[PDB]
Design a protein around this ligand. Structure first.
Ligand SMILES: O=P(O)(O)OC[C@H]1O[C@H](n2cnc3nc(O)ncc32)[C@H](O)[C@@H]1O
Ligand SMILES: O=P(O)(O)OC[C@H]1O[C@H](n2cnc3nc(O)ncc32)[C@H](O)[C@@H]1O
Ligand SMILES: O=C(O)c1cccnc1
Ligand SMILES: O=C(O)c1cccnc1
Lengths: 341, 341
């Protein structure tokens, strides 16, 4: 794991300089394509991309897991919805599925801890049947967190061997906005009230309880903010850990990862805490409608491209942004040159 | 023309209600897809769409024209760049071209007033060789403005007959951000300084002059803000008029139009002034990096989906947003239903 982390490559400044120059020579006023130009340059510096902005195969990895904290009344969806939706993922009827197909991306459903019988068709990496209830203790052990990080990391880089060049992260887990809020609070130093949202339509009444639960989790566990693994293990969840693992894996692999919404931001904070070298590989997608979104993003210093007021999760926003990544590549490779004004 | 305007259909509330209900029944927490849901409903109310959110063929219409105001030193690009770029449009090497191909949209290049010999391959609807210099008088006559509105309007609806269901608007015209700023100032009641930007990399030094030119145009022409045609004809340009015409045509046709950037916002203000019935057919794309963008958008009460810091024009932002429109349709038609949680 420390090996893994040690080997995350730095971005290729040489390739980025060449990219910048090329972009500057295209048939348009310099810098006129704004963020599309920056994105192209960013991609060029990613070693797994072979010195140029390009997109081969695309994959969205959905990490599914249950949380003991559901027992605290923090989620309106019944627990079984995780298991149900995960099965649905195999039939292509969910929101991510539909958006991924539209982007020509393949969806990988990964069970890292659903509290139900295994689902055929789903990738099995289950830690346990739901994680511990963070309101009364840790979600899992450090060992457990590290093992999963490792396993997902590897799974991720292996896909690279198969032509995938662009990943998207997603999750599925009733009550997951709760641990996500706790992590955000911890990493950013914000008070719980500021980052706790309505999740999947939690009634406004029910909010207070959610806030208290978050505070409780933190007080009880005393997660160390300087230790991303410590935080994940104490007040995170298997799904969150899994997302962090995709990020570490893609970075080690020298490839880009598209973030999704709120849950993904929490995982990104942990990943960057654990390995700052991860940062350059992350690409924001959309601006989640979850309350703590702004705070979370400010800490990652990211400005999403899409303002859609989305709050579904599943990696749906990631899929929706894929065409943008492809657009930056198209611009780079297909535009004519000034020299030929 | 008044006929044309009179016949713009109202949105189909019946179809929209059915759409809303269907969306609500999809396999996700209600309202979880935010703006994608709203967009789908909007599309459903458009009569040319046959009661459902759908996308058939896509077209981006680029209106090209020269402006006499270029003589005032308000643009750094040489005048010929309009003619050059317009030819380039026929070869698929420009920014819009590349982005449109990526979206599976076809680009229609329309010459409404380039100050050069006709370009083979370009649609000929030329009013004159560049419009009058707004700093010393009107851009054109009212008659001229109305005629062009009519002609473009018709051209637009005719494309509908050929399977196009979604339009994008764009332009090409050195110095065009100048008349665009004047229109914005006029319609919104903002002072020139607040809405005059750098256009295609105008040096910061050169700004003052640009502001004065705008003020001059207005003082001299005294455009009536309550009369959109009056404004267009006095302080607009052939390209701007042409964009307004696509908007009027698509609306009459009962079809959606994707806006682009700053120039497009100015044209939209005029269109809505002329015919408020046009409003429901307009769809924002991106948030232009031009200074007066925010003001312009506030007046249209539109919040763009994409924050890319783009400022190229040509209809490039419109093309980039097409996949989003298609995503809303995919969501609508392909997601599974709750009833089948
Ligand atoms: O913390 P809560 O309020 O439960 O919200 C987080 C969950 O809701 C999101 N979520 C995604 N697809 C969903 N499908 C259903 O049916 N419910 C929630 C869904 C997210 O992915 C988590 O599973
Ligand atoms: O008012 P200015 O500073 O001239 O900016 C508006 C123009 O610049 C934009 N524009 C688009 N493609 C371009 N290609 C070149 O080469 N220059 C400007 C271009 C816009 O479409 C207008 O033609
Ligand atoms: O931003 C998200 O991804 C999100 C917000 C609420 C519920 N589920 C997911
Ligand atoms: O917003 C635009 O479309 C734009 C801004 C500057 C120059 N050309 C186009």
């Amino acid at each position: 794991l420390h090996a893994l982390l040690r080997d995350i490559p730095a971005p290729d400044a040489e390739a980025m300089a060449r990219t910048q120059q090329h972009i500057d020579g295209l048939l348009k006023p310099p810098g006129s394509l704004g963020r599309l130009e920056t994105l192209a340059v960013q991609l060029a510096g990613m070693p797994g991309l072979n010195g140029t902005p390009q997109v081969g195969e695309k994959a969205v990895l959905v990490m599914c897991a249950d949380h003991g904290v559901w027992d605290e009344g923090v989620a309106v969806s019944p627990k079984i919805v995780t298991a149900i939706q995960a099965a649905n993922m195999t039939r292509g009827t969910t929101g991510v599925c539909v958006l991924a197909a539209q982007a020509g991306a393949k969806v990988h459903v990964i069970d890292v801890g659903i509290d139900a019988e295994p689902i055929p068709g789903v990738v099995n990496m289950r830690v346990a049947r739901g994680c511990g209830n963070i309101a009364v203790g840790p979600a899992m052990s450090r060992l457990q967190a590290e093992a999963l990080l490792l396993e997902v990391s590897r799974y991720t880089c292996d896909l690279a061997q198969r032509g995938v060049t662009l990943f998207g992260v997603g999750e599925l887990g009733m009550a997951n906005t709760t641990p996500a809020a706790a992590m955000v609070s911890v990493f950013t130093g914000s008070d719980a009230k500021e980052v706790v949202g309505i999740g999947a339509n939690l009634p406004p009444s029910r909010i207070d309880n959610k806030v208290d639960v978050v505070r409780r989790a933190i007080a009880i566990n005393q997660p160390n903010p300087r230790d991303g693994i410590d935080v994940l293990s104490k007040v995170g969840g298997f799904d969150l850990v899994g997302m962090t693992g995709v990020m570490l894996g893609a970075a080690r692999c020298g490839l880009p990862v598209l973030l999704d919404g709120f849950l993904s931001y929490s995982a990104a904070l942990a990943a960057c805490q654990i390995a700052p070298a991860v940062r350059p590989y992350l690409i924001p997608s959309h601006f989640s409608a979850e309350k703590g979104a702004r705070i979370a993003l400010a800490h990652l210093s990211m400005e999403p491209y899409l303002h859609m007021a989305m709050r579904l999760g599943e990696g749906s926003g990631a899929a929706l942004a894929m065409p943008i990544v492809e657009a930056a590549c198209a611009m780079f490779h297909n535009m004519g040159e000034l020299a030929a004004i």
